[PDB]
Amino acid sequence: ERIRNVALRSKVCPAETASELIKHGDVVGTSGFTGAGYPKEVPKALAQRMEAAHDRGEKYQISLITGASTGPQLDGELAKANGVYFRSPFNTDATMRNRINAGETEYFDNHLGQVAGRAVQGNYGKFNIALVEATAITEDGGIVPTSSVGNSQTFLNLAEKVIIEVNEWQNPMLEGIHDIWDGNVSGVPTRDIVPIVRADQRVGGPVLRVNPDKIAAIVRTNDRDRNAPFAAPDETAKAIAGYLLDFFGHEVKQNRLPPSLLPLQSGVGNVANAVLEGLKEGPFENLVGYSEVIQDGMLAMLDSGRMRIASASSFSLSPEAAEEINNRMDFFRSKIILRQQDVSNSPGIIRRLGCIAMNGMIEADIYGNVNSTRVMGSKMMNGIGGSGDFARSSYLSIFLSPSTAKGGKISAIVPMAAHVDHIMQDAQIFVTEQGLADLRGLSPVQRAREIISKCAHPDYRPMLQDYFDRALKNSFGKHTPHLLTEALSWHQRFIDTGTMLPS
Amino acid sequence: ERIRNVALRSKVCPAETASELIKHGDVVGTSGFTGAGYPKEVPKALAQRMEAAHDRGEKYQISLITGASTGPQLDGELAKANGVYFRSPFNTDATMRNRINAGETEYFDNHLGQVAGRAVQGNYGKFNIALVEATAITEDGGIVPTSSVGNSQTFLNLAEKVIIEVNEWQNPMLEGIHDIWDGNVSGVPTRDIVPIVRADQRVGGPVLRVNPDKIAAIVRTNDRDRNAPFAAPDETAKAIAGYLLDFFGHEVKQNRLPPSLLPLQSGVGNVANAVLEGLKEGPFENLVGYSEVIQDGMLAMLDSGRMRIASASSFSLSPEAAEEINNRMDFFRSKIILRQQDVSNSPGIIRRLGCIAMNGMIEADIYGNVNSTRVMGSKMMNGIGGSGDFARSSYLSIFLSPSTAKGGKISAIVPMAAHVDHIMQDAQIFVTEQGLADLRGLSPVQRAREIISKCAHPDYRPMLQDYFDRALKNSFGKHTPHLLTEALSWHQRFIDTGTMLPSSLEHHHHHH
Ligand SMILES: CCCNC(=O)CCNC(=O)[C@H](O)C(C)(C)COP(=O)(O)OP(=O)(O)OC[C@H]1O[C@@H](n2cnc3c(N)ncnc32)[C@H](O)[C@@H]1OP(=O)(O)O
Ligand SMILES: CCCNC(=O)CCNC(=O)[C@H](O)C(C)(C)COP(=O)(O)OP(=O)(O)OC[C@H]1O[C@@H](n2cnc3c(N)ncnc32)[C@H](O)[C@@H]1OP(=O)(O)O
Ligand SMILES: [Cl-]
Ligand SMILES: [Cl-]
Numbered sequence A: 001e002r003i004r005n006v007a008l009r010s011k012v013c014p015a016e017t018a019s020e021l022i023k024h025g026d027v028v029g030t031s032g033f034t035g036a037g038y039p040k041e042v043p044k045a046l047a048q049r050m051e052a053a054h055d056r057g058e059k060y061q062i063s064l065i066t067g068a069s070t071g072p073q074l075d076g077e078l079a080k081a082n083g084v085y086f087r088s089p090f091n092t093d094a095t096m097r098n099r100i101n102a103g104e105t106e107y108f109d110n111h112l113g114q115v116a117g118r119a120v121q122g123n124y125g126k127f128n129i130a131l132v133e134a135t136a137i138t139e140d141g142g143i144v145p146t147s148s149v150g151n152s153q154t155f156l157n158l159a160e161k162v163i164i165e166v167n168e169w170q171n172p173m174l175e176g177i178h179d180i181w182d183g184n185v186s187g188v189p190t191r192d193i194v195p196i197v198r199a200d201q202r203v204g205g206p207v208l209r210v211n212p213d214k215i216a217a218i219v220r221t222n223d224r225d226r227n228a229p230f231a232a233p234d235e236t237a238k239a240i241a242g243y244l245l246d247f248f249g250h251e252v253k254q255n256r257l258p259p260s261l262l263p264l265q266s267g268v269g270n271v272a273n274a275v276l277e278g279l280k281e282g283p284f285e286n287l288v289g290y291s292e293v294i295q296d297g298m299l300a301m302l303d304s305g306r307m308r309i310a311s312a313s314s315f316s317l318s319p320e321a322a323e324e325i326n327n328r329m330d331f332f333r334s335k336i337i338l339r340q341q342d343v344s345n346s347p348g349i350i351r352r353l354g355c356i357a358m359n360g361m362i363e364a365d366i367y368g369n370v371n372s373t374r375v376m377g378s379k380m381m382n383g384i385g386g387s388g389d390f391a392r393s394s395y396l397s398i399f400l401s402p403s404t405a406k407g408g409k410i411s412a413i414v415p416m417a418a419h420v421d422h423i424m425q426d427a428q429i430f431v432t433e434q435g436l437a438d439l440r441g442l443s444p445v446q447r448a449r450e451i452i453s454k455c456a457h458p459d460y461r462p463m464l465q466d467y468f469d470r471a472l473k474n475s476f477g478k479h480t481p482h483l484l485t486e487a488l489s490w491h492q493r494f495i496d497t498g499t500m501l502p503s
Numbered sequence B: 001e002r003i004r005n006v007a008l009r010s011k012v013c014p015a016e017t018a019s020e021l022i023k024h025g026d027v028v029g030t031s032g033f034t035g036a037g038y039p040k041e042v043p044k045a046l047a048q049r050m051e052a053a054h055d056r057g058e059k060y061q062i063s064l065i066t067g068a069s070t071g072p073q074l075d076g077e078l079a080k081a082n083g084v085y086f087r088s089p090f091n092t093d094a095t096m097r098n099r100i101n102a103g104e105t106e107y108f109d110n111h112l113g114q115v116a117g118r119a120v121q122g123n124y125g126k127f128n129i130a131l132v133e134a135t136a137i138t139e140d141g142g143i144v145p146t147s148s149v150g151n152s153q154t155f156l157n158l159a160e161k162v163i164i165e166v167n168e169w170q171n172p173m174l175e176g177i178h179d180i181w182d183g184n185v186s187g188v189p190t191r192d193i194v195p196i197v198r199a200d201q202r203v204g205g206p207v208l209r210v211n212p213d214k215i216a217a218i219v220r221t222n223d224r225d226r227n228a229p230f231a232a233p234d235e236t237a238k239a240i241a242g243y244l245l246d247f248f249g250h251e252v253k254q255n256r257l258p259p260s261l262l263p264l265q266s267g268v269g270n271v272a273n274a275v276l277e278g279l280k281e282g283p284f285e286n287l288v289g290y291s292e293v294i295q296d297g298m299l300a301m302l303d304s305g306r307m308r309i310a311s312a313s314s315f316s317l318s319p320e321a322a323e324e325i326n327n328r329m330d331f332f333r334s335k336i337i338l339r340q341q342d343v344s345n346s347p348g349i350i351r352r353l354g355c356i357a358m359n360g361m362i363e364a365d366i367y368g369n370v371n372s373t374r375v376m377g378s379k380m381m382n383g384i385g386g387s388g389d390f391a392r393s394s395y396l397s398i399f400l401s402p403s404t405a406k407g408g409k410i411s412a413i414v415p416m417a418a419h420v421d422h423i424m425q426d427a428q429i430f431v432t433e434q435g436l437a438d439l440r441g442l443s444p445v446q447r448a449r450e451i452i453s454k455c456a457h458p459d460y461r462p463m464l465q466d467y468f469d470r471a472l473k474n475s476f477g478k479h480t481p482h483l484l485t486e487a488l489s490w491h492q493r494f495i496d497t498g499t500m501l502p503s504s505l506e507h508h509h510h511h512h
């Protein structure tokens, strides 16, 4: 029995009835982070009732605030129903992405570590509903989270009414893996000092806390987390990993990093995951993770023993990896700590621990400004996520990408980024399959020489050098030379012709 | 006597001789932050010898790393001499700015709170010289800083050799105003918890620490800081301050801020001065500053009790205010704390205290991304400074600017910023003399509607609205609509014609 508090069993009701607690205009905070631990059955019932209401000519939309990305049962279903008027902070569902890029759902991708604080400040409005997935409800009424923690504790604090989905699909042995801190991380200033001084330090307890009087409904569910698999590292990804591992090796040899490196943060995506695959058989032992997420590769690192322990807010496992950890939860449970996302992504803690940040990117310009989010400057991919949290706060900020995209039709190194998420100051190292650019110490024109020569694809490098050389001659100022008549012209060329390569 | 350690008196020597310790190629770390507490006599002597070398075909340049901005005697003299091959992290000297924008001095404007850490990591190379201005040297060889702390403790730690300038112009009773911590803020990980939980909290001691064996020279000096003329509020600044104070008043009446607000950070200038004058007149009490700087307007508030404490790394005072804080240093030393800049600008502390950040800007685009640094995308003004430290970490991030620049020929609200320092996520409130845009809760298209309607100048609003409307119809995606063919075209128009305003001899979509 998952609901171990006998009194709360009287609150069990159908998902459909529970969804009726959610009214047009409601601000709804949910569990869910990188396709892990989001509610499933209540959103589906909601979505159907929304569609019905729209047909009758009744407005029915909500504001949906999450930990980060969710899954087809939540973002997918509600987007199909046209039922979300505002979404924050991070999405990876294709149907919701389409709503966002069509202007049908309003979207703001906050820094993930800041979302709890902004919610408490009231930036999203009053929380009408918290909808949280649980593994179990303890005898004293504690809510055991599932495969993520995210913002669930904050949403439970803020919400007028609480709906809990108790998901029998989730592993009962997850209980104990979470660390939920009682202190003021994201509340009214002055905030508390968070006493984490080692990446493996537990400072909290295993359950979310909530006043039982606020629980309006408990829904028994049975449905799987769903996420995409990662691309098995190809020649490009392996080349990137090789350059980065060589780099770490040199840093250690020059005594600029310990032999066990520093706590590692590995971002979302295939490239970051391939680096981890490299590290699992690498020359750095006793590694520690202090990350936003644990992807397949990090789990692989724990398995090989190269990494001793990993801190994160969530799992981001492929279907096959997810099945792996559940068969072996007793081996992995002691190697993993799942924290609130305002703690995993705390800039104070990230800087204190000296994290190494490794993140993907859409594109960088020749001066090493980075776009993580908006293709051609206007079309959202996923969101900034915690990449800003970690890039700015880290000891070393590394960005990783194939040098081209769309089968060579796009250069990932451009004259000017069409959108900036990470400024020059927040990016020190760039790696593509062409090589590695170490920008420490360098002015912007010196950054450009390194990025162009080390990272750009041979198809595009002469064009980039041509832009830079002519900018140096003709730019308004020479500190960060640009030709404004053509800075964004490669992007426009792609829009116009389907390729950044001239005819 | 300012040098109270007898042994160190033997290292006193003339400025010119001290300057000979600095060699071509050297990396030099100096005191100096917002025009306060930078060395003066040794840089002047160095510049002379640099020029003399150059005249004989001999190379002589240094790398100059500071706290932040310095003044004519340092950045000015060395720039005139063409003596600086690399400069970091922040400059406001006009001659040095010209070297930077001509490509004669390489420049990187690091986040001010990060500079110490990157120096310790080795990003600037090995420090050959630390050149630091002092009020006094204590009996046990402690170095009492002057009108700023900046990065001086880190530079003293890293440098192979140390030169101290003891400046008798600086009031002796500055001793005690500084708080220097020996804790690991910017050293090798894992770093220490910095335990500051109140803006008035001291965690360290009154002196910089240095192994006396590294002190190669001490120079007796007597010269003024750069006390920039008071920037008297004009009507634009007063309007901006008016909107901001009205906003604060409303936040308090809605219980989203205490009647004592939260610790305040402001940049320097016209607008900040108007805001400080407004606070002195307003309905708020028990104010607290946690900032980079002490500005003129604070002294009156510390005097009256309106402000209880001001934390900063430096003084940023007019001649009037600078001489008044001197004649009353016994009083003001109890009301002010000067900290290392890696503590004044610590993101963890700024967030913990819940600072309200109020910063200037070159321009913002319609979606509320902010340029603080690079005019037309390529020409450096001053540098990012601590604006990223505070904007990102603050409880509320506010950007304040006239809606136009260059006598109306530039719009400070543009289709696309030519350079970005602060992304949308780091900017919640915009204020111009046209009004205040509160962007909390808003998507980028919603941000644009508020920025265009509240902040843009009437001469530019129709052009902005036209760009936005056509972008909404034609952009590659509609999440942050752009027209890449014309996104930077207002900037190019300024480069080519000296104005962003269009000619009616040509078609423009908003004219119809
Ligand atoms: C600690 C917080 C970490 N979180 C974050 O960094 C969140 C933001 N980052 C991200 O979303 C991902 O890292 C990125 C930026 C999408 C990169 O992901 P990744 O390493 O898996 O890259 P990958 O090369 O596989 O490309 C992923 C997608 O982006 C597309 N893409 C990547 N670079 C692109 C570019 N320069 N232009 C256009 N599309 C691009 C790529 O085509 C693919 O989309 P489709 O499958 O074709 O629809
Ligand atoms: C806590 C750390 C705070 N530190 C920082 O914010 C450092 C970065 N910020 C800064 O340097 C300043 O806030 C800014 C952005 C230069 C604005 O300065 P300010 O608020 O005193 O405004 P002000 O209108 O006086 O402008 C300063 C200069 O920039 C120029 N300027 C301002 N906006 C401009 C624009 N949109 N286009 C071109 N020039 C512009 C202005 O003409 C003036 O130049 P001059 O010295 O007369 O040749
Ligand atoms: Cl650097
Ligand atoms: Cl801290």
Ligand SMILES: [Cl-]
Binding pocket: A110, A118, A123, B439, B440, B441, B442
């Ligand atoms: Cl917000």
